[PDB]
Amino acid sequence: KTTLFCASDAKAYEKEVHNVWATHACVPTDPNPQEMVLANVTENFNMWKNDMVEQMHEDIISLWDESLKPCVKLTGGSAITQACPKVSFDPIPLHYCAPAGFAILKCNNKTFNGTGPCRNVSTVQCTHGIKPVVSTQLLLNGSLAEEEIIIRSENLTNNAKTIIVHLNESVNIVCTRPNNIRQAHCNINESKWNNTLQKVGEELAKHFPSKTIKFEPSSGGDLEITTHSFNCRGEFFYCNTSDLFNGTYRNGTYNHTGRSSNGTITLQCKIKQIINMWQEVGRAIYAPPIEGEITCNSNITGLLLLRDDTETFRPGGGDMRDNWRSELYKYKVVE
């Protein structure tokens, strides 16, 4: 349809790189925006074919190119060298805004699965604040669903299509490299994981009804997708999730199978210098980790799954557009 613009609340005195990027690329935010209901209207959306996702993907690539420069970038035959200073890195929310003569329709159905017709609709100038958080397997620091866990997929019959599970209740995950400098670990409270996967198995069962529902760890691929990978405080964490995606839900009951201990699952993590890039097909080399305690305390707010009687789901990811989709699903640009 058109070219969106971004509004953020960043300040120009922060050294933090999302703030810096935003202060030259985004406009400040309307302190009181203005919505506009239309509960008879009913319009369709398709989260899987939504141009806003492409545009924000562009922006985040831009942000990362200006903020997290690699010492080396290998793409094609070429290798680029640049200065790769350690930086202050903590994502801030970004709002996407329709320019003059355009609006953003927001679907207000709190159970809207992301495709098809939506009953109650609003008009808005901008989306909510969206933290551009790059990760795999687990979606972090998003917006919880308001009613019940929600299964999203372009086509749930096509097992090659990523599934986005939208949780309604955060599950804490705490990842730390304490004070091998490249070793770290994550802690999740097993009870709340227990619970979350049981409710998720419930919903998945609604969609696949005769079958037991198995959670298993990612089969194969680059480390970036076979582990829960993400950037914490500038450093690239790769966390093993085999004791996380490991359990069966059979008789309306979830049994967790992965090893726990003292009531918490603990992921073993490596901090890594050589990265397979999400932005494009290529490799990126970074400097060794900063010093001291590197810790991120995050909210798991959704999952990225791939489906292989029984249905089996393993963690997926790799296409960062899906992350943006998970927040942008309820919006389209009109007029």
Ligand X SMILES: CNCc1ccc2c(c1)N(C(=O)OCc1c(F)c(F)c(F)c(F)c1F)[C@H](CNC(=N)N)[C@H]2NC(=O)C(=O)Nc1ccc(Cl)c(F)c1
Ligand Y SMILES: *[C@@H]1O[C@H](CO)[C@@H](O)[C@H](O)[C@H]1NC(C)=O
The residues binding ligand Y (CB under 6 A) are: 91, 113, 115-116, 133, 140-141, 148-149, 151-153, 155-158, 168-169, 199, 202-203, 216-217, 223, 226-227, 230, 232, 240, 242-243, 246, 257-259, 296-298
Can you spell out the DSSP letters for 165-180? EEEEEEEEEEEEE---
Give dist(CA 246, CA 242) in Å, integer.
6
Give dist(CA 167, CA 329) in Å, integer.
14
Q: How far is the CB of 36 from ligand X (least distance, A)?
A: 34
Residue nearest to ligand X (CB): 318
Radius of gyration of the chain (CA): 20
Q: How far is the CB of 31 from ligand Y (least distance, A)?
A: 21
Please identify, among the stretches 104-112, 170-178, 188-196, 218-226, the one whose residues bind ligand X according to the rule CB under 6 A.
Answer: 218-226
Nearest CB to ligand Y, comparing residues 26 and 139? 139
Our separate counts of H helices and E strands in the chain read: 5, 24
235 binds ligand X (CB under 6 A): no
Exactly one of 236, 249, 254, 286 binds ligand X (CB under 6 A); that residue is 236
Please identify, among the stretches 128-136, 170-178, 211-219, 240-248, the one whose residues bind ligand X according to the rule CB under 6 A.
Answer: 128-136
Q: Which of 126, 198, 114 is nearest to 156 (CA)?
A: 114
User: Is 326 in contact with 137 (CB distance < 8 Å)?
Assistant: no
Q: Which of 138, 141, 144, 142 is nearest to 169 (CA)?
A: 144
Give dist(CA 233, CA 86) in Å, integer.
9
Instruction: Decide which of ligand X, ligand Y, none touches 229; Cβ closer than 5 to 8 Å per partner kind.
Output: ligand X
**For residue 49, which amino acid is it?**
K
Other C-beta atoms closer than 10 Å to the C-beta of 98 total 24
DSSP 29: P
Exactly one of 21, 112, 193, 230 binds ligand X (CB under 6 A); that residue is 230
217 binds ligand X (CB under 6 A): no
Instruction: Decide which of ligand X, ligand Y, none touches 251; Cβ closer than 5 to 8 Å per partner kind.
Output: none
Q: How far is the CB of 122 from ligand Y (least distance, A)?
A: 19
Phi-psi bin for 22: left (phi > 0), alpha (psi -120 to 50), beta? Answer: alpha
Q: How far is the CB of 297 from ligand X (least distance, A)?
A: 17
List of residues contacting ligand X (CB under 6 A): 134-136, 222, 224-225, 229-231, 236, 275-278, 280-282, 318-319, 321
